[PDB]
Amino acid sequence: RFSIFETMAMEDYEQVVFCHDKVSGLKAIIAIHDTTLGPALGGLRMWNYASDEEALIDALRLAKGMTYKNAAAGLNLGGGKAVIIGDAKTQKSEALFRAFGRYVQSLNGRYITAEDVNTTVADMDYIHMETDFVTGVSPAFGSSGNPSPVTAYGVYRGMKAAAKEVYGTDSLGGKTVAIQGVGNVAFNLCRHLHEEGAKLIVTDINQDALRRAEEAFGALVVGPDEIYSVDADIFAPCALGATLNDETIPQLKVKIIAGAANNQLKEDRHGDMLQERGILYTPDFVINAGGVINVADELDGYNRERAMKKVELVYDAVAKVIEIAKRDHLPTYRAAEKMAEERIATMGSARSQFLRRDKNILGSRG
Ligand SMILES: [Ca+2]
Ligand SMILES: [Ca+2]
Ligand SMILES: [Ca+2]
Ligand SMILES: [Ca+2]
């Protein structure tokens, strides 16, 4: 059934750009959903898609995702995402990333790219050779801009906010948090949680990762399949997405979900289930926004203190989604979508009077 244009119509996508270069064998999709708030910011992601169609669907899905992520995050950015089709192991060249960066320069700052999955500051520095519409590449972001602890602080602050609602106190003192995954971002969330005096049950597909964790925080290890059934107050999915589904959600003994993974929900039903089951689902794209807020900050000359003080406010953003769920009698995830759509609409109206020059987040556009 799937028709590029019927999807763009139904979902209201602005632009989808297909890019090819001969010598680099570049096949790239830049997807731009909504730019009401400003330039579309979204990671470049490289992957071995089975078909053109697989890649388009992923590009579109992830682009609309950034529209909500960025809008809710209070950022003056739209929803975009780019995607290269190929083997990240074998097909990265200079020409690949230069050619792509040229096609990013072609859109004259409607798309701003950054590192995502299977792409690195090294790749972005090739893009940077052709365009200034790339972020996470400056000396300031290079020196003291190491992103993991900032995403983590976002998630930490958002969890605090959720706890205030259900428990009546934002203290995570003597709370048990089930933590799926102990990657960089998770490891740093564990640190804030241990320092507040919280009990940590964890899992990971990696053994060295697990032992580093139990060594440093004294966390009880548990089997990948057990983590959902475990007896804890808060579940924190920080590994993969679609971890909240038909199979896992009935197991949950927790009162809050508050993790770092993108697209925790496998389907929207799973949002409404967590609802019926009386579990407060603190939505992905609100809580883990810290990552995008960090690169967005570079656009204005990077300052980690300012980034952290802006991410500190993920608490206030979560608390607003809760308020909106109660007030509009909606499930958390649909309240977060509303909050983002309310803001887009509001600023589309509040800035609809003529100025010879409107100020946007591109300082010196290049
Ligand atoms: Ca060419
Ligand atoms: Ca070719
Ligand atoms: Ca979404
Ligand atoms: Ca992220």
PDB file of N, CA and C and ligand atoms in Angstrom, residues 20-23 103, ligand 1:
ATOM      1  N   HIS A  20      22.214  11.006  -4.259  1.00  0.00           N
ATOM      2  CA  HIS A  20      23.146   9.986  -4.800  1.00  0.00           C
ATOM      3  C   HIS A  20      24.446  10.670  -5.231  1.00  0.00           C
ATOM      4  N   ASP A  21      25.581  10.016  -4.966  1.00  0.00           N
ATOM      5  CA  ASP A  21      26.887  10.337  -5.597  1.00  0.00           C
ATOM      6  C   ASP A  21      27.473   9.050  -6.183  1.00  0.00           C
ATOM      7  N   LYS A  22      27.927   9.095  -7.440  1.00  0.00           N
ATOM      8  CA  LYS A  22      28.558   7.943  -8.143  1.00  0.00           C
ATOM      9  C   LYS A  22      29.730   7.394  -7.313  1.00  0.00           C
ATOM     10  N   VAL A  23      30.861   8.118  -7.226  1.00  0.00           N
ATOM     11  CA  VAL A  23      32.176   7.551  -6.774  1.00  0.00           C
ATOM     12  C   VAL A  23      32.063   7.072  -5.328  1.00  0.00           C
ATOM     13  N   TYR A 103      24.951  17.964  -0.150  1.00  0.00           N
ATOM     14  CA  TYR A 103      23.474  17.857  -0.282  1.00  0.00           C
ATOM     15  C   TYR A 103      22.781  18.467   0.953  1.00  0.00           C
TER      16      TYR A 103
HETATM   17 CA    CA B   1      27.110  12.714  -8.769  1.00  0.00          CA
END
